[model samples]
Target: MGKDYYQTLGLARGASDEEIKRAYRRQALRYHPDKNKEPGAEEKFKEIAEAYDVLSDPRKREIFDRYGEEGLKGSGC
Candidate 1:
């Protein structure tokens, strides 16, 4: 199953772009495999990247807000 983008980045459903990027940067640093080496760091990093992609773009965020993760699928985005 796809992960919840907001939760993955420790963001509220109504978080702003700044909030999302803040959380993503924090998590990306902590989860960086070269630094942390935790078992799930890579997977977590990818998840965060995906979440950032949607949250950072107004259009993608709009689609995500309306249809959730499925909005990103089959769009080649």
Candidate 2:
């Protein structure tokens, strides 16, 4: 696909639904300023959040799977 969300979540190609959510939380926690308190900023958090957004979403996930994070919209001109 376009941008592999699985890679961001560190999962296999076909991970379970719950499994996907599990990773998003854990991953985000690792980057949380209150938790990590390191140099890296929330910028990374937003990056991870967007990936989870796509994966967690059904319609977007299907389109993402078929056409990737690139467009994945209905037919147009």
Candidate 3:
């Protein structure tokens, strides 16, 4: 199954753009390599970045909301 961006970011599907940004900022910082310095911190940061990338882009977000991960990949998002 594909990763759910909303779940990854601890948000609901109907979250506003501002909410998305806040959630991304919070989690990204928490998982940041320098701050975390723990096993898998880099991986976690990468995942956070990927989730933020998709949700922060209107075009990608639209594709994700409509058809999910496969759609995102198909659209080159």
Highest TM-score model number: 3
Per-residue accuracy of model 1 over 11-77 as CA lDDT, tens digit each: 7557888887777678788778778888988877776777767757778778777777776662343
Point out where model 2 deviates above 4 Å: 71-77
- Which portions of model 3 show Cα errors greater than 4 Å? 74-77
Each prediction's whole-model lDDT (CA): 0.73, 0.67, 0.76
lDDT tens readout by residue for model 3, 1-77? 55667777787667878988888778988889878978988898887777878758878788877877767663243
Which scores better on TM-score, 1 or 3? 3
Residue 56 displacement in candidate 1 (angstroms): 2.4
lDDT for model 3, on a 0 to 1 scale?
A: 0.76
**Between 2 and 3, whose TM-score is larger?**
3
lDDT of 1 at 74: 28
In the range 1-77, model 2's lDDT, one tens digit per residue, is 34556677677546766887788778878787778866775767766776767657866677666666456442222
